[PDB]
Copies of this chain bind each other. A is one copy, B any other.
């Protein structure tokens, strides 16, 4: 009935159909510009309980306010108190400050609202995604039978590559269709091999697909975080001696805490020797394929599958991930948002070389930051960097450092002074920088170390 009133809530084609659209989006842009301009820390420091109370009090039933005012309210309450990856002291996790071409692509994705499940919901988008996927297969130097699909991120990609592996091995061993029949009777013997430092989405993937955490067999890691190749075949051979069936092996290209890259070529050799599927978790370090350091990923091009997550080191907005396969017939076992537009635009604008130069810069800078910590007597460096993470702690001659560094991390977060990672290294609490922003200077790091020390002094 009052359809004329409803027209303002929607975009329409033809003359004047998008005037309100342009007005509203111009308004949202200015609102966000004002937020960014007034940000002076990674977090506002607002009491999380007070923030929670104010959000909980918001009226979602009888407010019915003009959209521009709802945008102002969200700017003020939501945006102002968010975590600003764009601030130099937000430096904890694989949580990327977004690239401009991805933020622009999102504006077009939203307005078009294409659905990737069929051509007639995603005409030009279907071809864009395939073009990006084709280009990706070329960058990782995959075979002529290679293909890929965009997913929600590294988690869904890991789960998909491993679920492909699950169906692949059952078909191999006994021509058994898991898709039609469920898991085969020997499923309880199947085992996925991975490092102690691989992402927990390996165990989670195994649970989801019905094998359970018990299906995951770990191999000891080295001290730099890499899988220990001198133990690998032994773990596989002992399993087989016990009647177990190692069917998949996960090589990690960029561990979450160390940024370690497994020996992919040796892992690929093991996959050949023992007839396993190699899945490469390239969520973090897969971006190095564009850099001067591509050689560290040698063996990746031999993978059965590879998870690539663009919303980490490619700086794309969440979600943006792909799963690649060396042989697209493996997609037979399996027989949605336009996130590929982000990568399509990025590569035309910033381009792959620039991205690689950024990563070269990040690796060098991370070495420099380790050196800064090493020579600073209020800190202790806890590992030598492998990629763009730094592992370190505040130090004191009498204080209980586990206690100090846990308190430190949470205080810095709560006050909005810095957003720092926290892990265990060698049995000790470590703080973590995950350096992603390629525009930080040594003075940023110097100021960051000083903020952290000033907090340590008070605890």
Chain B residues with CB under 8 Å of A128's CB are 55, 78
List of B residues within 8 angstroms of A213 by Cβ: 179-181
Alpha-carbon distance between A120 and B91 when the two chains are bound, in angstroms: 11
Q: Is the CB of A183 within 8 A of B181?
A: no
Stretch of A245-253, A344-352, A446-454 lying at the B interface: A344-352
Do B26 and A29 have beta carbons less than 8 Å apart? Answer: yes
In the complex where A210-B183, A212-B178 touch, is A100 in contact with B351 (Cβ < 8 A)?
Answer: no
Verify B70–A101 contact, CB threshold 8 A.
Answer: yes
Residues of B within 8 A of A124 (CB): 51, 55, 77-82
Q: Mark A90-125, 1 if CB is under 8 A from B, else 0.
A: 001101111111111111111111110011111111
Q: Is there contact, CB below 8 Å, between A58 and B99?
A: no
User: Contacts of A318 on B, CB cut-off 8 Å?
Assistant: 113-115, 336-338
Q: Which of A3, A13, A70 has the most CB of B within 10 A?
A: A13
Contact (Cβ within 8 A) A98 B64: no
Could you tell me which residues of chain A, from 379 to 413, have a CB within 8 Å of some CB in chain B?
A: 413
Contact A51 B121 (CB under 8 A): no
Stretch from A262-270, A279-287, A434-442 at the B interface: A434-442
Report how far A231 CA is from B265 CA in the complex, Å: 57
Set B7, B71, B345: member contacting A439, Cβ < 8 A: B7
Is the CB–CB distance between B131 and A55 below 8 Å? yes
Contacts of A223 on B, CB cut-off 8 Å?
Answer: none
Of B18, B119, B353, the residue contacting A48 (CB under 8 A) is B119
Segment of A30-38, A232-240, A298-306 engaged in the interface with chain B: A30-38
A371 within 8 A of B: no
Closest to A39 in B: B13
Among B61, B65, B104, B352, point to the contact of A352 (Cβ < 8 A).
Answer: B61
Copies in the assembly, this chain:
2
A317 at the interface (CB under 8 A from B): yes
A1 touches B357 (CB 8 A): yes
Instruction: Please provide the chain A residues from 329 to 348 with a CB less than 8 Å away from any CB of chain B in the complex.
Output: 336-338, 341, 344-345, 347-348
Is the beta-carbon distance between B36 and A74 smaller than 8 angstroms? no
A100 to B6, Cβ gap below 8 A? no
Whether A438 lies near B345 (C-beta < 8 A) is no
- Residue A354 lies at the interface, judged by CB distance under 8 Å to chain B: yes
CB within 8 Å of B: which A1-21 residues = 1-3, 6-15, 17-21
Tell whether A25 is near chain B: CB-to-CB under 8 Å: yes
A67 at the interface (CB under 8 A from B): yes
Task: Indicate whether A214 sits within 8 Å of B113 (C-beta atoms), given known contacts A36-B21, A55-B127.
Answer: no
Is A455 in contact with chain B by the CB < 8 A criterion? no
Tell me which residues across on chain B come within 8 A of A275, comparing CB atoms. none
Contacts of A62 on B, CB cut-off 8 Å? 351
The answer to whether A457 has its CB under 8 Å from any CB of chain B is no
Residues of B within 8 A of A378 (CB): none
15 further contact pairs, Cβ within 8 A, besides A26-B29, A98-B113, A166-B210:
A8-B100, A9-B101, A13-B40, A14-B40, A24-B103, A56-B134, A60-B131, A60-B352, A71-B108, A78-B108, A79-B108, A82-B124, A83-B123, A110-B317, A182-B187
9 tightest CB-CB pairs across the interface, nearest first? A210-B210, A182-B212, A106-B110, A60-B347, A13-B39, A18-B36, A64-B351, A81-B124, A55-B127
A-B contact pairs, 15 of them (CB 8 A): A1-B364, A6-B438, A21-B32, A25-B29, A51-B123, A51-B124, A55-B124, A60-B135, A73-B348, A79-B112, A81-B123, A82-B124, A107-B107, A109-B317, A208-B208
